[PDB]
């Protein structure tokens, strides 16, 4: 019964094609609820879930002003990073940010996050203490020194322990019917001969929320990790997720195989087998 709020920022430079684009999205758990895009005609924080639509104009206006200022800060950051790495002004680069809080069922803080990546590689992160930083390299050590002098960590701690938790609790209350509802997977097993000798068994999970799920195949009760093809969990587009796991089995041996499904929304985990009809 824990929950997370996260903001995910992406800034991408594009020399010769204007200033770097800034995109923000906000999530509660696996539910997106806001966006901002500096390439929109009229950039503004916009709702992306129904339960946020009730926030008043002051919410939307203040958050829009924050994201515009963040875009400007990230553009300064991008220029500084290019210099810290002795990079050409000709190339494109990416700065990503992620931050937010985890709470338990009691609404108490479990942990906070505030971290960054440059060109897809971890750059600097606020430690779990919400007081100190981990820098990846000598460039990030520059940022660390600057952020220590500016007492950035103190301000991030204050947001993570205060605003972040308080607004996450508000959103959970207002979005309760969805955000606090687990939808269990609908499951089945399919069978497809591949040759006279072997067949694929595919165990499906559809329609579930949240995304976290475990699908495993066992042969005689032993997990078949090396022999299971497991696709990434994927969004359906209706808030729910899908996943399958497949194994290739000797023809005639299908009853030795069981698919095991674990998910929040289930009263108990499922054991499934191919049911020939």
């Amino acid at each position: 019964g824990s929950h997370s709020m996260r903001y995910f920022y992406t800034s991408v430079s594009r020399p010769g094609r204007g200033e770097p684009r800034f995109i923000s999205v906000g999530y509660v758990d696996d539910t997106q609820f806001v966006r901002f895009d500096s390439d929109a005609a009229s950039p503004r924080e916009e709702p992306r879930a129904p339960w946020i639509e009730q926030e008043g104009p002051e919410y939307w206006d203040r958050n829009t002003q924050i994201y515009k200022a963040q875009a400007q800060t990230d553009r300064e950051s991008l220029r500084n990073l290019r210099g810290y790495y002795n990079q050409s002004e000709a190339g494109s680069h990416t700065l990503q940010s992620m931050y937010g809080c985890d709470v338990g069922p009691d609404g108490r803080l479990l942990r906070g996050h505030n971290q960054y990546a440059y060109d897809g590689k971890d750059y600097i992160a606020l430690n779990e203490d919400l007081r100190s930083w981990t820098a990846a390299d000598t460039a990030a050590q520059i940022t660390q020194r600057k952020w220590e002098a500016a007492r950035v960590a103190e301000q991030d701690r204050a947001y993570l322990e205060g605003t972040c938790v308080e607004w996450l609790r508000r959103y959970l209350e207002n979005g309760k019917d969805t955000l606090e509802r687990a939808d269990p997977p609908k499951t089945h097993v399919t069978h497809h001969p591949i040759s006279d000798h072997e067949a694929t068994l595919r165990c499906w999970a559809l329609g579930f929320y949240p995304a976290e799920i475990t699908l495993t195949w066992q042969r005689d009760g032993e997990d078949q990790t090396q022999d299971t093809e497991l696709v990434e969990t994927r969004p359906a587009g209706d808030r729910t997720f899908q996943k399958w796991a497949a194994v290739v089995v000797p023809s005639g041996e299908e009853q030795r195989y069981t698919c095991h499904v674990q998910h929040e929304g289930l009263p108990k985990p499922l054991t499934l087998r191919w049911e020939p009809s």
Binding site: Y7, S24, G26, Y59, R62, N63, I66, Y67, A69, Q70, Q72, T73, D74, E76, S77, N80, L81, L95, Y99, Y116, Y123, I124, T143, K146, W147, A150, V152, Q155, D156, Y159, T163, C164, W167
Partner: peptide, 9 residues
């Protein structure tokens, strides 16, 4: 709701 920006890198 988002955090305010603080200092560039």
């Amino acid at each position: 709701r988002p955090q305010v920006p603080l200092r560039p890198m």
